[PDB]
Design a protein around this ligand. Structure first.
Ligand SMILES: [Ca+2]
Ligand SMILES: [Ca+2]
Lengths: 51, 78, 51
């Protein structure tokens, strides 16, 4: 995470193995338009949801 | 049985979801997208009307009262 | 190395295998908050020093 303000430009980093992951049984870079709608989980973009 | 949205089947015998009910783009002939769900009623291409209706902004001042309050045909801009 | 000038922009590159290295016997992306202090070598930041 970085603050690119210049006037207070700073950054922070932590080691974490955030590697590509894929639901289902096949590796893909991007979900193909056509396919099986399998159950998966994603962080809800709505900032009001509570985890 | 399951089907493409993993949810209910409309009376026409086609499958639908409450999320797509408010995608802004009609899914089935009976029910779905005209009935209430939380919505981005006006897109950037759309013009609001004072009664709360939303209409494609290109319709404003086209000559027809396309929103039920007629705000799209007011001489205030036309 | 490159000169950010847009119109006078130029750059030059050399095939150098500058692979991330580590002192000690544990790999790391970043020297952690703390651990064993060990003898290491660093290119000093002060121009008055000479190699
Ligand atoms: Ca829809
Ligand atoms: Ca009109």
């Amino acid at each position: 995470v970085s603050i690119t303000s210049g006037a207070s430009e700073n950054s922070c980093t932590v080691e974490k193995k955030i590697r590509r992951k894929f639901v289902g049984r096949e590796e893909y870079l991007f979900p193909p338009v056509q396919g099986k709608l399998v159950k998966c989980h994603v962080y809800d973009r709505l900032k009001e949801t509570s985890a | 049985a399951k089907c493409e949205p993993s949810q209910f089947q409309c009376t026409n015998g086609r499958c639908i979801t409450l999320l797509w009910k408010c995608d802004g783009d009609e899914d089935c002939v009976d029910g779905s997208d005209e009935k209430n769900c939380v919505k981005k009623t006006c897109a950037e291409s759309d013009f609001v009307c004072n009664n709360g209706q939303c209409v494609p902004s290109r319709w404003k001042c086209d000559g027809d009262p396309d929103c039920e309050d007629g705000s799209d045909e007011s001489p205030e801009q036309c």
